[PDB]
Amino acid sequence: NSPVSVFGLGAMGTALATQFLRKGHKTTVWNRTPAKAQPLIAIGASHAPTIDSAAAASSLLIICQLDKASVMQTLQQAPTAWAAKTIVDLTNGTPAHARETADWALAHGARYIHGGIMAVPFMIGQPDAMILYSGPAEVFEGVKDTLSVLGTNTYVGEDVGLASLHDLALLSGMYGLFSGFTHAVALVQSANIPAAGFVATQLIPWLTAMTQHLNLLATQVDEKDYGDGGSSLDMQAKAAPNILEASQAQGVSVELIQPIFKLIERRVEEGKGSEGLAALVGMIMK
Amino acid sequence: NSPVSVFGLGAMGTALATQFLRKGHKTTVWNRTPAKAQPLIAIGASHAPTIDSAAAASSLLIICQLDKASVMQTLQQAPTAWAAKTIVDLTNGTPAHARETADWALAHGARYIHGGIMAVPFMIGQPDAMILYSGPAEVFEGVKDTLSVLGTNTYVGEDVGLASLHDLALLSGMYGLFSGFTHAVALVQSANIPAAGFVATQLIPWLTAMTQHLNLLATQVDEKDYGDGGSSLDMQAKAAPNILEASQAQGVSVELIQPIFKLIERRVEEGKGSEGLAALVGMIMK
Ligand SMILES: NC(=O)C1=CN([C@@H]2O[C@H](COP(=O)(O)OP(=O)(O)OC[C@H]3O[C@@H](n4cnc5c(N)ncnc54)[C@H](OP(=O)(O)O)[C@@H]3O)[C@@H](O)[C@H]2O)C=CC1
Ligand SMILES: NC(=O)C1=CN([C@@H]2O[C@H](COP(=O)(O)OP(=O)(O)OC[C@H]3O[C@@H](n4cnc5c(N)ncnc54)[C@H](OP(=O)(O)O)[C@@H]3O)[C@@H](O)[C@H]2O)C=CC1
Ligand SMILES: O=C(c1ccccc1)C(F)F
Ligand SMILES: O=C(c1ccccc1)C(F)F
């Protein structure tokens, strides 16, 4: 159980450090605001008094702060502390941010991989958690068994920005799901329908079926052949006004769902109403 | 196996009529454009020469056309044909549309229930299909065993507009899901990543986990207590710019995902960044 250091003790960094502790690792912790270390000290963490101390304590240095600007602030406070260490940066950012941080790390003698945590904090250490990783394969292979205590490791390749592209794509997908949740639950709550009961009984099973449907849509995207699948855009463009008008009648804003209806309408206006929803991917691409 | 008539032989009405035929019902079919009956004639349907003939053939009359205006056009072509028949109207519409059509039906001597088909055509007759129904319970009970061949029957109550509210809420949820799919797949395709492979391997498992998460969100909505759940809006408002900027870098429009980020930003600006996503429901409500 190799020593690990965690920089960033917010909700997620706390979950990561806690899981290292459960798995028997000497877990050194650092946070910009030191009071946040107290809960972790109480369950066995070693609270580093400085950035340099936290870096010195371990060879595997996990950074889970806020954004890339925050990561660079921490790295630059102790520029010589990182040499011959492996930085695993789990802080949300763009592909470009990962490449920028990697360039800095390599120039300061450190090894670097970037990862994207596909979990909320309570999922860490649980079977459904997964973390995407990218950067030099030999670097990842040196730390993958320690990192595996957090979740399933999904190494996507050598390009250090690639895990971030996968991450942000998955988050995009989730934000659409949550847009749908918000709209659906506002509509039922407008009629005093139990939200949890509706969501467990009706919404989740429907979304499960329509999630499986995404396989067919994705095949159509790859084929660039946008079959209706039995559900043409012409037909959907005549249902969309009903969803909008019913929402207006219930006092529910349509802001979260209007964009896809405008895209569907545009495809109908282009003369392609006989196609299905897989057509919409290319419509938002360059 | 009681005789059934189907009005509307588009993708969905064809699927409904086909399933009645497989289950041994004398299945009478009608379509505004008569050529569309030919595939169903070939597998045993009785093609009605008129609206009145189709109504006369059965006591259970299913209407699956386009919108409420279309339903009223069919009903009004033969106003005396509906007396002492049960109309099951599966044509998409608002709660108000169902109430309007029901008022007409009752004034012309017919029984009426409205339903919302939670299925695409290939799902009809399969275990995952479900149809929502509302209107007089005694009317529904008279036809529920015949209707059960199509999917699971979910009778929601006596108010004839209620199935349509549930339907449009579920469709709203699905359109958010599909917004997420579209954005996520455009981002990976911008980097030449296989769409089907990404969706099957990464997107679907992530959406499955985040769909289960909707139970927690829904409980928080019912409680009007918008705990962060480990994922505060303040934190999400610092990730959202990364998703937007990465999308811009890949040439992908952000139109489908920008609205939820604007709502998150607004909640942070209101001083409620410490809350979680369940807060967004009330934000779009009256
Ligand atoms: N929570 C979640 O569900 C998920 C989070 N993520 C990502 O994980 C990361 C952490 O999220 P989470 O823990 O929830 O966020 P929190 O808001 O709970 O914590 C943010 C952390 O970043 C630190 N930080 C902010 N600015 C700086 C700075 N300039 N220098 C040093 N440290 C700084 C904070 O320190 P201080 O205490 O001093 O403010 C704190 O440790 C983010 O990048 C997030 O996008 C990934 C997946 C899920
Ligand atoms: N397909 C799907 O995935 C789903 C569809 N639905 C709903 O089911 C219904 C049917 O959808 P679907 O079959 O896919 O749509 P289609 O576009 O395939 O068929 C539309 C049907 O409506 C008929 N119609 C349109 N205008 C009129 C009119 N004025 N008078 C009489 N008939 C008319 C068409 O007749 P004609 O051939 O003469 O044009 C045709 O039979 C819609 O309300 C839809 O929202 C529900 C869930 C899923
Ligand atoms: O638009 C509708 C739909 C589209 C795809 C799948 C399921 C339903 C609904 F109005 F028919
Ligand atoms: O914003 C993020 C997130 C929010 C909820 C669930 C999972 C992830 C990510 F940037 F952290």
Coordinates of C-alpha atoms in Angstrom, one line a residue, chain A residues 5-279:
Chain A
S5 CA -0.9 12.5 -1.2
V6 CA -4.2 14.3 -2.0
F7 CA -4.3 18.0 -2.8
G8 CA -7.8 19.4 -2.5
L9 CA -10.1 18.3 0.3
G10 CA -13.5 19.3 -1.0
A11 CA -16.3 16.9 -1.3
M12 CA -14.5 14.8 -3.9
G13 CA -11.0 15.0 -2.5
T14 CA -12.3 14.0 0.9
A15 CA -14.0 10.9 -0.7
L16 CA -10.7 10.0 -2.5
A17 CA -8.6 10.3 0.7
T18 CA -11.1 8.4 2.7
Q19 CA -11.0 5.5 0.3
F20 CA -7.2 5.4 0.4
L21 CA -7.4 5.3 4.2
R22 CA -9.8 2.4 4.1
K23 CA -7.4 0.5 1.8
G24 CA -4.4 0.9 4.1
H25 CA -2.5 3.6 2.4
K26 CA -0.6 6.2 4.3
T27 CA -2.7 9.1 3.1
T28 CA -1.2 12.6 3.3
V29 CA -3.6 15.5 2.8
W30 CA -3.4 19.2 1.9
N31 CA -6.0 21.9 1.4
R32 CA -5.7 25.6 0.6
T33 CA -8.1 26.2 3.6
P34 CA -6.5 24.0 6.3
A35 CA -9.6 23.6 8.5
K36 CA -11.0 21.2 5.9
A37 CA -8.4 18.6 6.8
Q38 CA -9.9 18.1 10.3
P39 CA -12.4 15.3 9.4
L40 CA -9.7 13.4 7.6
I41 CA -7.2 13.8 10.4
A42 CA -9.7 12.2 12.7
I43 CA -9.8 9.0 10.6
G44 CA -6.0 8.7 10.1
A45 CA -4.8 11.1 7.5
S46 CA -1.5 12.9 7.8
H47 CA -2.1 16.6 7.5
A48 CA 0.8 18.2 5.5
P49 CA 1.8 21.7 6.9
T50 CA 2.9 22.8 3.4
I51 CA 2.6 22.0 -0.3
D52 CA 6.2 20.9 -0.3
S53 CA 5.6 18.6 2.7
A54 CA 2.7 16.9 1.0
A55 CA 4.7 16.4 -2.2
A56 CA 7.6 15.0 -0.3
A57 CA 5.5 12.4 1.6
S58 CA 4.5 10.3 -1.5
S59 CA 5.5 9.4 -5.0
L60 CA 1.8 9.4 -6.2
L61 CA 0.3 12.9 -5.9
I62 CA -3.4 13.3 -6.6
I63 CA -4.7 16.8 -7.3
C64 CA -8.5 17.2 -7.1
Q65 CA -9.1 21.0 -6.6
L66 CA -11.5 23.1 -8.8
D67 CA -10.1 24.0 -12.3
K68 CA -6.8 24.1 -14.1
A69 CA -6.1 27.6 -12.9
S70 CA -6.2 26.2 -9.4
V71 CA -3.9 23.3 -10.2
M72 CA -1.3 25.6 -11.7
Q73 CA -1.5 27.9 -8.6
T74 CA -0.7 24.9 -6.4
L75 CA 2.1 23.6 -8.6
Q76 CA 3.7 27.0 -8.9
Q77 CA 3.8 27.6 -5.1
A78 CA 6.5 24.9 -4.8
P79 CA 8.0 24.5 -8.3
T80 CA 10.8 22.1 -7.3
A81 CA 8.6 19.8 -5.2
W82 CA 7.3 17.7 -8.1
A83 CA 10.5 16.3 -9.6
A84 CA 10.5 12.5 -10.0
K85 CA 6.9 12.3 -8.7
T86 CA 3.8 11.1 -10.5
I87 CA 1.1 13.7 -10.6
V88 CA -2.5 12.3 -11.2
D89 CA -4.6 15.4 -11.9
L90 CA -8.3 14.7 -11.4
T91 CA -9.3 18.3 -11.6
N92 CA -12.0 19.1 -14.2
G93 CA -10.8 20.8 -17.3
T94 CA -10.6 21.0 -21.1
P95 CA -8.3 18.8 -23.2
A96 CA -6.2 22.0 -23.7
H97 CA -6.0 22.4 -19.9
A98 CA -4.6 18.9 -19.5
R99 CA -2.0 19.5 -22.2
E100 CA -1.0 22.9 -20.7
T101 CA -0.6 21.4 -17.2
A102 CA 1.3 18.4 -18.6
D103 CA 3.8 20.7 -20.4
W104 CA 4.4 22.5 -17.1
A105 CA 4.8 19.2 -15.2
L106 CA 7.3 17.7 -17.7
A107 CA 9.3 21.0 -17.6
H108 CA 9.6 20.6 -13.8
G109 CA 10.7 17.0 -13.8
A110 CA 7.4 15.4 -13.0
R111 CA 5.4 12.6 -14.6
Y112 CA 1.8 13.5 -15.3
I113 CA -1.5 11.9 -16.2
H114 CA -4.9 13.4 -16.3
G115 CA -8.1 11.8 -15.2
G116 CA -11.8 12.4 -15.2
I117 CA -13.8 11.1 -12.3
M118 CA -17.1 9.6 -13.5
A119 CA -18.6 9.4 -10.0
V120 CA -20.2 11.6 -7.3
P121 CA -18.3 11.4 -4.0
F122 CA -20.5 8.7 -2.4
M123 CA -19.8 6.4 -5.4
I124 CA -16.0 6.4 -4.9
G125 CA -14.9 2.9 -4.0
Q126 CA -18.3 1.5 -5.2
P127 CA -18.8 -0.8 -8.2
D128 CA -20.3 1.8 -10.4
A129 CA -17.5 4.4 -10.1
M130 CA -15.2 4.8 -13.1
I131 CA -12.3 7.1 -13.7
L132 CA -11.0 7.9 -17.2
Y133 CA -7.2 8.3 -17.6
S134 CA -4.8 9.5 -20.3
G135 CA -1.2 10.3 -20.8
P136 CA 1.9 8.2 -21.0
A137 CA 1.1 4.5 -20.7
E138 CA 4.1 3.7 -18.7
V139 CA 3.3 6.4 -16.2
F140 CA -0.3 5.1 -15.8
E141 CA 0.9 1.5 -15.5
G142 CA 3.1 2.5 -12.5
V143 CA 0.2 3.8 -10.5
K144 CA -2.9 1.9 -11.9
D145 CA -3.1 -0.7 -9.1
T146 CA -3.2 2.1 -6.4
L147 CA -5.7 4.1 -8.4
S148 CA -8.0 1.1 -8.8
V149 CA -9.2 1.4 -5.2
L150 CA -11.2 4.5 -6.3
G151 CA -13.1 3.0 -9.2
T152 CA -12.8 1.1 -12.4
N153 CA -9.8 2.5 -14.4
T154 CA -10.5 3.4 -18.0
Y155 CA -7.2 4.3 -19.7
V156 CA -8.2 5.9 -23.1
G157 CA -4.7 6.5 -24.6
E158 CA -1.5 8.4 -24.7
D159 CA -2.8 11.9 -25.5
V160 CA -3.0 13.6 -22.1
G161 CA -6.1 15.6 -23.2
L162 CA -8.1 12.6 -24.2
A163 CA -9.6 11.6 -20.8
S164 CA -10.9 15.2 -20.5
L165 CA -12.6 15.0 -23.9
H166 CA -14.4 11.7 -22.8
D167 CA -15.2 13.2 -19.4
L168 CA -16.8 16.4 -20.8
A169 CA -18.7 14.4 -23.4
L170 CA -20.1 12.2 -20.7
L171 CA -20.9 15.2 -18.5
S172 CA -22.7 16.8 -21.5
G173 CA -24.8 13.6 -21.8
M174 CA -25.6 13.8 -18.1
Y175 CA -26.6 17.5 -18.3
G176 CA -29.1 16.7 -21.0
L177 CA -30.5 13.9 -18.8
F178 CA -30.8 16.4 -15.9
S179 CA -32.4 18.9 -18.2
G180 CA -35.0 16.2 -19.0
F181 CA -35.5 15.3 -15.3
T182 CA -35.9 19.0 -14.3
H183 CA -38.6 19.6 -17.0
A184 CA -40.5 16.3 -16.4
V185 CA -40.6 16.8 -12.6
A186 CA -41.6 20.5 -12.9
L187 CA -44.5 19.3 -15.0
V188 CA -45.8 16.7 -12.6
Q189 CA -45.2 18.9 -9.6
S190 CA -47.3 21.6 -11.2
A191 CA -50.2 19.1 -10.8
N192 CA -49.2 18.1 -7.2
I193 CA -47.9 14.6 -8.3
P194 CA -45.4 13.0 -5.9
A195 CA -41.9 13.6 -7.5
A196 CA -40.1 10.6 -6.1
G197 CA -43.0 8.3 -6.8
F198 CA -43.3 9.5 -10.4
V199 CA -39.6 9.4 -11.0
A200 CA -39.1 5.9 -9.5
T201 CA -42.2 4.4 -11.1
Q202 CA -42.6 6.2 -14.5
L203 CA -39.5 8.3 -15.4
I204 CA -36.7 6.0 -14.6
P205 CA -38.1 2.9 -16.5
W206 CA -38.9 5.1 -19.5
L207 CA -35.4 6.7 -19.5
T208 CA -33.9 3.1 -19.2
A209 CA -35.7 2.1 -22.4
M210 CA -34.8 5.2 -24.3
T211 CA -31.2 4.9 -23.1
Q212 CA -31.0 1.5 -24.7
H213 CA -32.4 3.2 -27.8
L214 CA -29.2 5.3 -28.0
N215 CA -27.4 2.3 -29.4
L216 CA -29.5 2.4 -32.5
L217 CA -29.1 6.1 -32.8
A218 CA -25.3 5.8 -32.4
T219 CA -25.1 3.2 -35.1
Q220 CA -27.0 5.5 -37.4
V221 CA -24.6 8.3 -36.6
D222 CA -21.6 6.1 -37.6
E223 CA -23.4 5.1 -40.8
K224 CA -24.4 8.7 -41.6
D225 CA -27.8 7.1 -42.4
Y226 CA -30.5 8.7 -40.3
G227 CA -33.3 6.3 -40.6
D228 CA -36.5 7.2 -38.8
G229 CA -36.4 4.1 -36.6
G230 CA -40.2 4.3 -36.7
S231 CA -40.2 7.8 -35.2
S232 CA -39.8 10.5 -37.9
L233 CA -38.8 14.0 -37.3
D234 CA -41.9 15.1 -39.1
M235 CA -44.0 13.3 -36.5
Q236 CA -41.9 14.6 -33.6
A237 CA -42.2 18.2 -34.8
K238 CA -46.0 17.8 -34.4
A239 CA -45.7 16.5 -30.8
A240 CA -43.2 19.2 -29.7
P241 CA -45.8 21.9 -29.8
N242 CA -48.0 19.9 -27.5
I243 CA -45.2 19.5 -25.0
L244 CA -44.5 23.2 -25.2
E245 CA -48.2 24.3 -24.9
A246 CA -49.0 21.9 -22.0
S247 CA -45.9 23.2 -20.2
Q248 CA -47.1 26.8 -20.7
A249 CA -50.5 25.8 -19.4
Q250 CA -48.9 24.5 -16.2
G251 CA -46.7 27.6 -15.7
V252 CA -43.5 25.7 -16.5
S253 CA -40.8 27.4 -18.5
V254 CA -39.7 25.6 -21.7
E255 CA -36.1 26.9 -21.6
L256 CA -34.5 23.5 -21.1
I257 CA -36.2 21.6 -23.9
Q258 CA -36.9 24.3 -26.6
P259 CA -33.4 23.9 -28.2
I260 CA -33.8 20.3 -29.4
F261 CA -37.3 21.2 -30.7
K262 CA -35.8 24.1 -32.7
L263 CA -33.2 21.7 -34.2
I264 CA -35.9 19.2 -35.1
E265 CA -37.9 21.9 -36.7
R266 CA -34.8 23.1 -38.7
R267 CA -34.3 19.6 -40.0
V268 CA -37.9 19.4 -41.1
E269 CA -37.5 22.9 -42.8
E270 CA -34.4 21.5 -44.6
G271 CA -36.7 18.9 -46.2
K272 CA -35.4 16.0 -44.1
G273 CA -38.4 15.4 -41.9
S274 CA -38.4 11.8 -43.0
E275 CA -35.1 11.2 -41.1
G276 CA -34.8 10.3 -37.4
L277 CA -33.0 11.8 -34.5
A278 CA -29.5 10.6 -35.4
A279 CA -29.4 13.5 -37.9

